[PDB]
Amino acid sequence: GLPWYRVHTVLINDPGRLIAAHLMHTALVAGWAGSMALYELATFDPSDPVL
Amino acid sequence: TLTYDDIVGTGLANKCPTLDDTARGAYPIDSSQTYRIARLCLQPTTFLVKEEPKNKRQEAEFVPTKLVTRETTSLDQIQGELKVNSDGSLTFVEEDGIDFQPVTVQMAGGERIPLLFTVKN
Numbered sequence: 029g030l031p032w033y034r035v036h037t038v039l040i041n042d043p044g045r046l047i048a049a050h051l052m053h054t055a056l057v058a059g060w061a062g063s064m065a066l067y068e069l070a071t072f073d074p075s076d077p078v079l
Numbered sequence: 080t081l082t083y084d085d086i087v088g089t090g091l092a093n094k095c096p097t098l099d100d101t102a103r104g105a106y107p108i109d110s111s112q113t114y115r116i117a118r119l120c121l122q123p124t125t126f127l128v129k130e131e132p133k134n135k136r137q138e139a140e141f142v143p144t145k146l147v148t149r150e151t152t153s154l155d156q157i158q159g160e161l162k163v164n165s166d167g168s169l170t171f172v173e174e175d176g177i178d179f180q181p182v183t184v185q186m187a188g189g190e191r192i193p194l195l196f197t198v199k200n
C-alpha cells in the first residue's frame with residue numbers, strides 16, 4: 029500500500045478533495061489564531077504599557 | 080406634579096428635582112429665624128476611581144468607571160439643621176435620611192469597586 033509518508037498523494041488527481049484538505053488546513057490555521065488570541069487575552073496584563 | 084404611577088419604572092425616582100433657568104435669585108437669610116433643610120438630594124452622575132500606579136512616585140489619576148448596579152445610586156429625603164453662625168456663614172448639620180447607597184462600579188479590564196456612597200453625619 030502507500031507508505032506512511034505518501035498518504036496525502038491520493039489528493040493529486042482529486043481537485044475536490046484537495047480543495048477540501050486545503051479548507052481543513054485553513055480552518056485549522058484560523059482556529060489556531062482564534063485560540064491563541066483567546067489565550068493571550070486570558071493571560072495579558074494591560075495595566076502597565078510602560079514597564 | 081407627578082404621581083407614583085407616572086414615575087414607576089421610568090428611572091425618574093433616582094433623579095433629584097431640578098430648578099428652571101429662571102431660578103437665579105437670592106434667598107434672604109434672617110439671622111433671627113431658625114432654619115432647616117427639609118430635603119437634600121444628591122444624584123451621582125459620575126464615579127471616578129484613583130488608579131494605583133506601580134512606581135508609587137507617578138501622579139495617580141482618577142479614571143472613569145462603568146456603573147453596574149443600575150439606577151439605585153442617589154441620596155435623598157435627607158433633612159437637617161441649617162444654623163446661622165456668628166460670622167454670617169451657614170452650617171448644615173445632617174440629621175436623617177436615605178443618606179447612603181451601596182454602589183459597584185467597574186474599571187476598564189473588569190475590576191469591580193464597591194463603595195458606600197454616603198454623606199452620613
Ligand code: CLA
Nearest residue numbers: 030032034035036037038039045048049050052053054056
Ligand atoms: C491539515 C491536517 C490534515 C488534513 C487536512 C489531512 C487529510 C487527510 N489525511 Mg492526513 N494526517 C495528518 C494531517 C492531515 N491529514 C497528520 C498530522 C497525520 C499524522 C497523524 C496524518 C496521517 C494520515 C494517515 C495515516 C492517513 C491520512 C489520510 C488523510 C486523508 C483522509 C482523512 C484521514 O484519514 O485522516 C486521518 C488523520 C487524522 C485522524 C489526524 C489525527 C489528529 C492528530 C493526531 C491530532 C489530534 C486532534 C486533536 C483534536 C488534537 C489533540 C490535542 C492534544 C493536546 C491532545 C485526507 C486527505 C488517510 C489517507 O487517505 O491515506 C491514503 C490515511 O490513511 N493522514
Ligand code: CLA
Nearest residue numbers: 030031032033034035036037038039040049050053056057
Ligand atoms: C506547502 C507545504 C507542503 C505541502 C502541501 C506538501 C505536500 C506533500 N509532501 Mg512535502 N515537504 C514540505 C512542504 C510541503 N509538502 C517541506 C517544508 C518539506 C521538508 C520538511 C517537505 C519534504 C517532503 C518529503 C521528504 C516528502 C514530502 C511528500 C509530500 C506529499 C505527501 C505528504 C504526506 O502524505 O505526508 C504524510 C505525513 C504524515 C502522515 C505525518 C508527518 C508528521 C510530521 C513529520 C511531524 C508533524 C508535522 C506538524 C503537524 C506540522 C505543523 C505545521 C508546520 C507548518 C509547523 C505531499 C504532496 C512525500 C512525497 O513526495 O511522496 C510522493 C515525501 O516523501 N514532502
Ligand code: CLA
Nearest residue numbers: 042043044045046047048049050051052053054055057058
Ligand atoms: C471564479 C473566480 C475564483 C475565485 C474568486 C477564486 C478564489 C479562491 N480559490 Mg480558486 N479556482 C478558480 C477560480 C476562483 N478562485 C477556478 C476556475 C479553479 C479551477 C477549478 C480554481 C482552483 C482552485 C483550487 C484547487 C483552490 C482554489 C482556492 C481558492 C481560494 C484561496 C484563498 C483562500 O482560501 O482564502 C480563505 C477563504 C476566505 C477568507 C473566505 C472566502 C469566502 C468564500 C469564497 C465565499 C464562498 C462563495 C462561494 C459560494 C464558494 C466558492 C467560491 C469559488 C469561486 C472559489 C480563493 C477563495 C484554494 C482553496 O479553496 O483553499 C481553501 C484551493 O485549494 N482555487
Ligand code: CLA
Nearest residue numbers: 033034035036037049052053054055056057058059060061
Ligand atoms: C506559511 C505558513 C504555512 C505553510 C506553508 C504550512 C504547510 C503545511 N502545514 Mg500548516 N500550519 C500553519 C502554517 C503553515 N503550514 C500555521 C500557522 C498553523 C497553526 C499552528 C498550521 C497548523 C497545521 C496543522 C495542525 C497541520 C499542518 C500541516 C501542514 C502540511 C500539509 C501538507 C503535508 O502533507 O506535509 C507533510 C508533512 C511535512 C512535509 C512535514 C513538515 C515538517 C515541519 C516543517 C516541521 C516539523 C517539526 C518537527 C519534526 C515536529 C514538530 C515538533 C513536535 C514535538 C510537535 C504543510 C507542510 C499538516 C501536516 O503536517 O500533515 C502531516 C497538519 O496536520 N499545519
Ligand code: CLA
Nearest residue numbers: 052053054055056057058059060061062063064065066068
Ligand atoms: C477574512 C479575512 C481576514 C482578515 C481581515 C484577517 C485579519 C487578521 N488576521 Mg487572520 N486569517 C484569515 C483571514 C483574515 N484574517 C484566514 C483565512 C486564516 C487561515 C489561513 C487566518 C490565519 C491567521 C493567523 C495564523 C494569524 C492571523 C492574524 C490576523 C491579524 C493580523 C493580520 C496580519 O498580520 O497578516 C499579515 C499578512 C501578510 C503578511 C500577507 C503576506 C502575503 C504574501 C506576501 C503574498 C505572497 C503571494 C502573492 C500572490 C504575491 C503576489 C502579490 C501581488 C499583489 C504582486 C488580523 C486581525 C494574526 C493574529 O493577530 O491572530 C490573532 C495571526 O497570527 N490570521
Ligand SMILES: CC1=C(/C=C/C(C)=C/C=C/C(C)=C/C=C/C=C(C)/C=C/C=C(C)/C=C/C2=C(C)CCCC2(C)C)C(C)(C)CCC1
Nearest residue numbers: 052053054055056057058059060061062063064065066067
Ligand atoms: C463547527 C462550527 C463552529 C465552531 C468552530 C469552532 C469552535 C472551531 C474551533 C477551532 C479551534 C479551537 C482550532 C484550534 C486549532 C489549533 C491548532 C491547529 C494548533 C496546532 C499546533 C501545532 C501544529 C503546534 C506544533 C508545535 C508544538 C506542539 C511544539 C512546538 C513546535 C510546534 C510549534 C511545531 C461555529 C459555532 C463557529 C459555527 C460553524 C459551526
Ligand SMILES: CCCCCCCCCCCCO[C@@H]1O[C@H](CO)[C@@H](O[C@H]2O[C@H](CO)[C@@H](O)[C@H](O)[C@H]2O)[C@H](O)[C@H]1O
Nearest residue numbers: 062065066067068069070071072073074188189190191
Ligand atoms: C465560542 C468560543 C468562545 C470561548 C470564550 C473563551 C474566552 C477566553 C478568553 C477571554 C478573556 C478571559 O479573561 C479572563 O478575565 C479575568 C480577569 O483578567 C480573569 O479572571 C481572574 O481575575 C479575576 C479578577 O482579578 C478574578 O475574579 C478571577 O477569580 C480570576 O480567575 C480570567 O483568568 C481571564 O481568563
Ligand SMILES: CCCCCCCS[C@@H]1O[C@H](CO)[C@@H](O)[C@H](O)[C@H]1O
Nearest residue numbers: 066069070072074186187188189190
Ligand atoms: C469569543 C470571545 C468572547 C469572550 C469575551 C470575554 C470577555 S472580554 C474580557 O473581559 C475581562 C473582564 O472585564 C478582561 O479582564 C479581559 O481583558 C477581556 O479580554
